[PDB]
């Protein structure tokens, strides 16, 4: 194959740095013919399934129930058809029956290096060897974004149970960058961060796309210009935004830098297994030799053709602790397999990930993802940076209820200017979605901003009714 | 000497674990005759000063101004008398004139691994080799506290600029413990943590003594018992408390576990260079072969005899990046050199560190440290867990003004029970300090608790005057 450090269990050279003039961390693995890589992925898939059969009673039980044993894996077609998908709910029941890490932990208790989790929540018991496999995978993908040794990398997401921050830090450390783990979550942190960014001038920033927006507003309140933070790029995970039309454009303009999308799931660390590159900068590439991504039809858990939408199903190829085999994300995306500008021979998610299928709501037979609303509003000059979607899942909705902020300049322009914006926002959303949208304007900067994941949907029946009645009155 | 891995620059075996039956991580370095260790410390002090002279223009300039060159270091007496102390203000001016890390960074920019700091603030540019020297030093000292490989260690302090959390995590990682970096700082974190502690049952907890108190109150609100978190110990740094009479007793009782004191300064990472051990569990030992501690008279920066009070002055023996040579802490302590129950041949701070000399205030010619008030109040059954000291530095104070919380049970007992507590608190503080104390009772749980460092002194002239006038009225 010629694939660099290709073995299971994996064991990377910690002293390797690619040549300064190379675009790729691993030229072979990253640019080899996709058919040659798929044969090796298949080979690895067999090694992993044999490993899980031996060390995980969770997989042994689940696979026996679905009529599967690792020997029946003779092709990628066998994998999608015979191997049952793992659900997040299955991980919970396993952890409840086999505490604290479940019957899929595999490694002995003595090998566990870090404890993290979700916030029923699940605990991540990550082995020392996997932490190294995560750090190496992430340094490689960060190198792909043009991040280099000696670059100051600001990691600005909460350092707690959440894998995002730890994952970007482990990659910064392995890349021999100057890791700056400022973190997030505490009051007063954002006002302090903009001063640190102004002084330190980092080459790269990590966090959520929502935090990058809130931070530019904080920089402005603090009379600092975020274009003067010396940023070459910002790379995000945790929610949609980095591949959202007007959202990506707003962040790139605010910072005078490039935005990269990355991130699958915390259970799927190394989660940068889906990530854009410096040249293939729109959307994300599926780094197949790190984690095997399948975009599947939710009705049968089989791959959809390229050019079609489905749900990502993920498999670890380089993990011995809590390995995930066909973990169902429950998210929606579109994948293609056209030539990539960076020359990496990987499938692509050209529009990133639209959102979680469960987050979608229906209004008059029309299916709507919150990211579609965020996209339409961010492409408007008068939009103030925040909104809330007010829905009900208890009864059918005839119209979409939006609470939207106008900009401070639209507000300063007076009552007619505010009304013009409100009617224009209503029309634009109606044109994009093909559904009636009622817009209530709220005062600039009244809606809560976040340094984590934005929760713009208010699914409360009482709140929905109160707003519809209030909008019907005015 | 026989001192384990004794070289400069230091380079520890990452695979070494002491035998399961050993009390000491490094038996020689930890238990050798103090006179034999002091000759080696002197030798190392020369290596460090030669290193700083060569690589730091900050030290070259400072030492030339004080009439010192490394060749004049012929004894420990020469070190205290000839070497000028470094002040935190000197570090600031150096960072302003030579941004971002100052003219004491020493290592090339390319060697910087992590960026942290204070919150003018100073930036810490820590090299890869020093991060390893910190992790090894901390695993060694944590082993001394009885913490072992495979033990679940909850690191519950903010992961941001602050060195405390990162330092305890690096030690947990190197000790091959199950590092659980939950962190702190965000709203809702404490309510979630008590559930994680109840489920996971960790062997050890790290944070501030103030956070441990607040967390037991949160565990109780959440109808959980903190004695059932399976804790064998809690180890703290960042402020006094872990060697404070009634404070140490309250935490040990609340959790049914042992409390260990550790911590010098963030500039002095590995900051566990002052730490108690499982057997010498009261106060802290000065781990002299990691960092050279001198308890000095502030009037001349020369060592005080054992049995006397002074200010800790610290020197790195195993750091190449931002090495601190005779950094003045500005804190107050007492040191002794009697036999230790663990058998470690190190000097001791039997009462830990009293506080920062600048935090001290005077009332009618009597010098008072806030930790003395905290000690007197915590030794009272009716005390509710929080208080504020209200002072003025602009004018002379005749009496001490205290805002004290009674317990919920003292409050439920009625007006006479509240009055009895208020007068008893006033008397007790008067007896301990030998000064008049005015006590104003505030409602239970009204005073802000913290997951960081407690700021109990309100030094505002308007607030002081408003309280004295209000107390004079009632
Ligand atoms: C640690 C990991 C990466 O931060 C993480 O966020 O895991 P978590 O369990 O907290 O959330 C995973 C979900 O978050 C969403 N997400 C995550 N990154 C994206 C994205 N780049 N585009 C769009 N949606 C995304 C998506 O719905 C994922 O299934
Ligand atoms: C990272 C490091 C250790 O957490 C730290 O706290 O550094 P920082 O600059 O934030 O504060 C240092 C000061 O905090 C105090 N402190 C610190 N640990 C103690 C203690 N165990 N007993 C009493 N007072 C202490 C003392 O005044 C120190 O000079």
Coordinates of N, CA and C and ligand atoms in Angstrom, one line a residue, chain A residues 162-164 206 236-240 261-267 271 284 329 331 353 355-356 453, ligand 1:
Chain A
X162 N -16.4 18.3 27.5 CA -16.4 18.5 26.1 C -15.1 18.2 25.3
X163 N -15.2 17.3 24.3 CA -14.0 16.8 23.6 C -13.4 17.8 22.6
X164 N -14.2 18.7 22.1 CA -13.7 19.7 21.1 C -12.5 20.4 21.5
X206 N -9.4 28.4 17.5 CA -10.4 27.3 17.5 C -11.5 27.6 18.5
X236 N -13.5 25.7 13.2 CA -14.6 25.4 14.1 C -15.1 24.0 14.0
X237 N -15.8 23.6 15.1 CA -16.6 22.4 15.3 C -17.6 22.6 16.3
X238 N -18.6 21.7 16.4 CA -19.6 21.7 17.5 C -21.0 21.9 17.0
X239 N -21.2 22.6 15.9 CA -22.5 22.9 15.3 C -22.3 23.4 13.9
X240 N -23.4 23.6 13.1 CA -23.2 24.2 11.8 C -22.8 25.7 11.9
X261 N -14.1 24.4 8.3 CA -15.1 23.5 9.0 C -14.5 22.2 9.3
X262 N -14.8 21.6 10.5 CA -14.3 20.3 11.0 C -15.3 19.8 12.0
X263 N -15.2 18.5 12.3 CA -16.1 18.0 13.4 C -17.2 17.0 13.1
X264 N -17.0 15.8 13.6 CA -18.0 14.7 13.5 C -18.8 14.7 14.9
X265 N -18.3 13.8 15.8 CA -18.9 13.7 17.1 C -17.8 13.4 18.2
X266 N -18.1 13.7 19.4 CA -17.2 13.5 20.6 C -16.9 12.0 20.7
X267 N -17.9 11.2 20.5 CA -17.7 9.7 20.5 C -16.7 9.3 19.5
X271 N -12.3 13.7 16.1 CA -13.5 14.3 15.5 C -13.2 15.2 14.2
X284 N -16.2 20.1 4.0 CA -15.3 19.1 4.7 C -15.0 18.0 3.8
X329 N -24.8 8.9 13.5 CA -24.8 10.3 13.9 C -26.1 10.9 14.1
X331 N -27.4 12.9 12.0 CA -27.2 14.2 11.3 C -27.6 14.1 9.8
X353 N -22.4 19.9 7.3 CA -23.5 19.1 7.9 C -24.6 20.1 8.3
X355 N -27.4 19.8 10.0 CA -27.9 19.7 11.4 C -28.3 18.3 11.8
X356 N -28.8 18.2 13.0 CA -29.4 17.0 13.6 C -30.8 16.8 13.0
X453 N -22.4 26.1 22.0 CA -23.3 25.8 20.9 C -24.6 26.7 21.0
Ligands
LIG1 C1 -16.4 17.1 20.1 C2 -17.3 17.2 18.8 C3 -16.8 18.2 17.8 O1 -16.8 19.5 18.4 C4 -18.8 17.5 19.2 O2 -19.3 18.6 19.0 O3 -19.5 16.4 19.7 P1 -20.9 16.6 20.4 O4 -21.4 15.3 20.9 O5 -20.7 17.7 21.4 O6 -21.9 17.1 19.2 C5 -21.9 16.3 18.0 C6 -23.0 16.9 17.1 O7 -22.7 18.4 17.0 C7 -23.0 18.7 15.6 N1 -21.7 19.2 14.9 C8 -20.5 19.0 15.4 N2 -19.6 19.6 14.4 C9 -20.4 20.0 13.4 C10 -20.1 20.6 12.2 N3 -18.9 20.9 12.0 N4 -21.1 20.9 11.4 C11 -22.4 20.7 11.7 N5 -22.7 20.1 12.9 C12 -21.7 19.7 13.7 C13 -23.6 17.5 15.0 O8 -25.1 17.5 15.1 C14 -22.9 16.4 15.8 O9 -23.7 15.1 15.7

